[PDB]
Amino acid sequence: MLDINAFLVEKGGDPEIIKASQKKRGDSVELVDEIIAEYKEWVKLRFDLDEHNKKLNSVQKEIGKRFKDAKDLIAEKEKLSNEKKEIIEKEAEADKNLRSKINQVGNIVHESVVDSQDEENNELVRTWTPENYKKPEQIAAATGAPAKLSHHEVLLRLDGYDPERGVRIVGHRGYFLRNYGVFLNQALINYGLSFLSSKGYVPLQAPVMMNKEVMAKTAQLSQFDEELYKVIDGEDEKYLIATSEQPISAYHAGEWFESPAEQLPVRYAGYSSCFRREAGSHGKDAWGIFRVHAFEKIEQFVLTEPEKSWEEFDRMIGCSEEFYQSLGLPYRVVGIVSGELNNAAAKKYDLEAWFPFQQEYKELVSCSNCTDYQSRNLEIRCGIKKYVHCLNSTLSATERTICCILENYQKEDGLVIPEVLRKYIPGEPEFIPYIKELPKN
Amino acid sequence: MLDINAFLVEKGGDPEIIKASQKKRGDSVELVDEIIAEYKEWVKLRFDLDEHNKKLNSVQKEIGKRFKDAKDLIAEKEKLSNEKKEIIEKEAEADKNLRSKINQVGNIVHESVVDSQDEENNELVRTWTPENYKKPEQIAAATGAPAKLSHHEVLLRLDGYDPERGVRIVGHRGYFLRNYGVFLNQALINYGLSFLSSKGYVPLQAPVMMNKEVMAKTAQLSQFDEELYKVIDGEDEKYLIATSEQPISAYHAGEWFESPAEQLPVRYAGYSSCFRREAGSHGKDAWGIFRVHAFEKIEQFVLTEPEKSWEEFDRMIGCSEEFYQSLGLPYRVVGIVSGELNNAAAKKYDLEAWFPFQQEYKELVSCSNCTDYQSRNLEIRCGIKKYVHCLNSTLSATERTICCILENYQKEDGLVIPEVLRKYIPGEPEFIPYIKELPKN
Ligand SMILES: Nc1ncnc2c1ncn2[C@@H]1O[C@H](COS(=O)(=O)NC(=O)[C@@H](N)CO)[C@@H](O)[C@H]1O
Ligand SMILES: Nc1ncnc2c1ncn2[C@@H]1O[C@H](COS(=O)(=O)NC(=O)[C@@H](N)CO)[C@@H](O)[C@H]1O
Ligand SMILES: Nc1ncnc2c1ncn2[C@@H]1O[C@H](COS(=O)(=O)NC(=O)[C@@H](N)CO)[C@@H](O)[C@H]1O
Ligand SMILES: Nc1ncnc2c1ncn2[C@@H]1O[C@H](COS(=O)(=O)NC(=O)[C@@H](N)CO)[C@@H](O)[C@H]1O
Ligand SMILES: [Mg+2]
Ligand SMILES: [Mg+2]
Ligand SMILES: [Mg+2]
Ligand SMILES: [Mg+2]
């Protein structure tokens, strides 16, 4: 969340900036005034508590002297004490409601972000096409072949996954990966780790379960509602993670980078499976492994000094671009409109790759600067309270990245294996043949 | 479960064999007599239902004729019908209780299994040591160095995992893998897949969630009690899998290998994460990644003709032995006593590898022939009811396999990388240095 003092003009903050941000977000502007009011009530209670302590100390110090009368001093002590009890209770309630309200306020939207609720207004930041690919159309970028099949059709013809047995065993969107489906997924995981490791990222495999209290410090309420699976463990509960961002953001909770010039930035190549209920996503992207309930993801997670996060943000999206360029996948980078930012993000870029069968750009990567919104909550201090900035960016959500590869590397008789992945696959195949026909053809 | 007819002498079965097996298992022998009694009650009801149908048909066929009187035929129809209703209800209840009882009976213990409740009596099947390793002692097998550190100490000195941040974020046994911890885990996963794929196994990545009704057909009750995590999905529930054995065993549920000579055996190299509450395991193996709540495992899963399963069982444990030999890890293979077999297993071998710091053999692999116990429940038919046999065997539970490597590949200044894994790790290191000191030293 934002610092309390950010709401307080008298403390150096600017509530106006916060209201403007709320407006850009399409979120409550009223929250800001309410937060300010409750803060003043809290301060009043704190002063009153202070005064009662002063009176109490004065009174019991008098009782000591008249200990030589003194049922009146006692009568007042009991009075002041009873009042103090009440004040103590109100203060704690006020602090609670104040923090609850502040928790609802999204991070300050960066001035460079387009103010809109309509993704049609996403900023077109950059476009990239591979060599020998004239323009985005219904043509597999890597092979030049007609993009005749969708990703799920390609994967079926390759005998690379099993949605039918998947659905019977797990329910909707359930799947097994098979044969080269497994090998390609592993290839992306290992290439991704190797790729980031070469750039100084530390490989970090995160647990996929988190304690509720920790999850609550890094995920917003809406995620608990329609995103996260709850785990029952005897009499206890945990959550399954939606992204390694969650546990890795808490990795340095309560720690202090007290010599940041030498200690930061810290860069993690996160790897985990990810689990999402997709509770608001019915029917959309029904077949294939494009949108599923469980998937693997190589994540960039970085902590930097507050003064260096914006440069790091550029470095991180640049890292993902280089990764997709290395796979020969056409893409565009877009600046997400204010109305589509989650609470933690001050700025977000998505990399959307070209799917030639769909003939559409589809999101493969989100890259966010969350400044100190999460680190304040997790108490991750920086230097000299000053907190580190946290940024996160997809490197590769592997099953969805496979979908993009499938459409762009297809040809008449099968699938060309992207050159950079070959060394990660037994036999280092350059090409794998279609094994099955589609029922429809 | 076993076939109903197995309990019925008149149907060609031998209840005596089943009672002897129950006794070997240390399980209820009474169950068998009860199952036989309830079957007879069920048969009685079936005959009575049959007779009522005959009478009813006779009666309503008379009512048709007197339709030319006839309130007596009607009075009897209503009588017979009311009786039939009751019989129908009793029959269904009997069938239910009969199957419930049969479900409690473990598979027939193979005659070659030692009859005992005490693992001290496990059969010592085979022992193996690598080259230049005289005998199992407190010496790292691969390097000849003193086995000075436990697996968790080695992993800590390598900065290869983080149990402290793991515990804070997930709770007891929680961990992150870091740096070469991640690379070694991936190395084992990919080597294992490549290894089995070269032997004709089909790589199959299983989903880690299963519908309750399907899980119930392959897991025994005790697993639901202290092993499986339940998942909350809105108003629905699923289970997390304890092993890819579970979903892969259900992969061919309701299918029919009608030309088994050509269609079987079918061999899967299963890969998944695995989740276990270890609810009955408090404090034991407290530190390290030897016994954890989440781990990866490459699994052998095979379906064969009933007449070929015993030969396949030998092939499968042989495959695992070859795998550990290739890693240079000393081990023994033991025939598990009858009293330690789960319900599905007719026979089980464990491969237990030498941990030189612990100076003990520790289980890394279980290999089981479950004959047709699971396939009967999942309706996986074979030829010409005749069901396939199912077998399963660990190839590598990767985190625990890492523990064995750590103790056996340690030397004074760090860890030698097993030769076969080198190609799976960026830089193909032959050795990685200790990075941190232990607090205690
Ligand atoms: N037809 C293909 N077969 C295999 N890999 C391909 C194919 N097309 C593109 N790629 C992969 O995608 C990457 C980007 O390809 S590219 O944009 O066309 N450029 C190049 O190929 C060269 N600039 C470098 O190889 C390549 O390095 C290659 O690994
Ligand atoms: N339900 C899903 N199925 C398959 N892939 C998904 C699913 N949801 C998200 N992804 C993939 O994972 C990527 C990152 O997810 S995200 O929600 O957008 N952002 C994050 O999780 C951040 N931690 C950055 O990775 C998406 O861009 C998409 O490529
Ligand atoms: N000191 C070591 N360094 C790296 N790898 C080792 C070491 N010791 C054993 N291994 C691995 O474990 C395997 C089995 O080793 S062995 O039993 O001693 N036998 C041999 O090394 C030879 N028979 C084949 O290399 C070897 O193939 C090797 O890959
Ligand atoms: N809690 C755990 N933590 C780490 N590894 C475990 C844990 N439980 C089991 N394993 C590893 O997984 C292996 C197989 O597990 S098993 O329960 O014995 N058997 C199975 O699951 C069978 N499907 C065969 O693999 C064990 O031999 C052990 O090496
Ligand atoms: Mg928002
Ligand atoms: Mg996104
Ligand atoms: Mg038993
Ligand atoms: Mg076992």
CATH dotted code for B1-106: 1.10.287.40
Ligand 3 atom nearest to CA at B133: 18
Distance, C-alpha B340 to centroid of its chain: 13
Nearest ligand, CA of residue B141?
3
Find the residue in A nearest to B218 (Cα).
A169
Angle at A366 (CA atoms; ends A361, A367), nearest 5 degrees: 130
- Torsions phi, psi of A215, nearest 5? -60, -40
Is A195 part of the contact surface with chain B (CB cutoff 8 Å)?
Answer: no
CB contact set of B58 (below 8 Å; sequence gap of 6+): none
Distance CA A327, CA A351 (A): 14
Q: What is the three-class DSSP state of B303?
A: strand
Cβ neighbours of residue A417 closer than 8 Å, sequence gap 6 or more: A184, A409, A425, A429, A430, A431, A432
Q: Kindly report, as residue ranges, where domains of CATH 3.30.930.10 are found in chain A.
A: 107-441
Q: How distant, in Å, are the alpha carbons of A9, A373, A404, A423, B190 from that of A186?
A: 53, 34, 16, 11, 8
> Encoding tokens for residue A190?
């290992």
Q: Is A384 helix (H, G, I), strand (E, B) or coil?
A: coil
Q: Is the CB of A176 less than 8 angstroms away from the CB of B426?
A: no
- For this entry, resolution in Å reads 2.0
Nearest Cα to Cα of residue B309 among B299, B320, B301: B301
CA distance A204 to chain B (A): 5
Looking at ligand 4, which atom is closest to the CA of residue B299? 25
DSSP label at B320?
H
Bond before B130 cis per omega within 30 degrees: no
Number of H helices, E strands in chain B: 13, 18
Question: Which atom of ligand 4 is found nearest the CA of B245?
Answer: 23
Whether A110 contacts chain B with CB within 8 A: no
Task: Pick the closest to residue A398 from A124, A139, A175 (CA basis).
Answer: A175
How far, in Å, is the centroid of ligand 5 from the Cα of A416?
40
Does A247 contact chain B (CB < 8 Å)? Answer: yes
Measured CA to CA, the distance from residue A40 to residue B432 in angstroms comes to 58
- Cβ burial of A306 (10 Å; 0-12, 13-18, 19+) is middle
CB-based contacts of B217: which residues, under 8 Å, 6+ apart?
A: B250, B253, B374, B377, B378
B211 touches chain A (CB under 8 A): yes
First-to-last alpha carbon distance for chain B, in angstroms, is 53
Distance of CA A168 to the CA centre of its chain: 31
Closest CA to B215 of B195, B237, B199, B197: B237
What is the three-class DSSP state of B349? strand
Superfamily for domain range A107-441: Bira Bifunctional Protein; Domain 2 (3.30.930.10)
Query: Cβ distance B270 to B233 under 8 Å?
Result: no
Joined tokens for residue B331? 């081990």
Residue written as token pair 């999204």: A106
Q: CATH 1.10.287.40 residue ranges in chain A?
A: 1-106
| Pocket mutation for ligand 4, best pick of B151, B272, B274, B278 (most atoms within 8 Å of C-beta) | B274
Check if the beta carbon of residue A185 is closer than 8 Å to that of residue A402: yes
Q: Which of B180, B204, B278, B422 best tests the A interface by mutation, with the highest count of A CBs <10 A?
A: B204
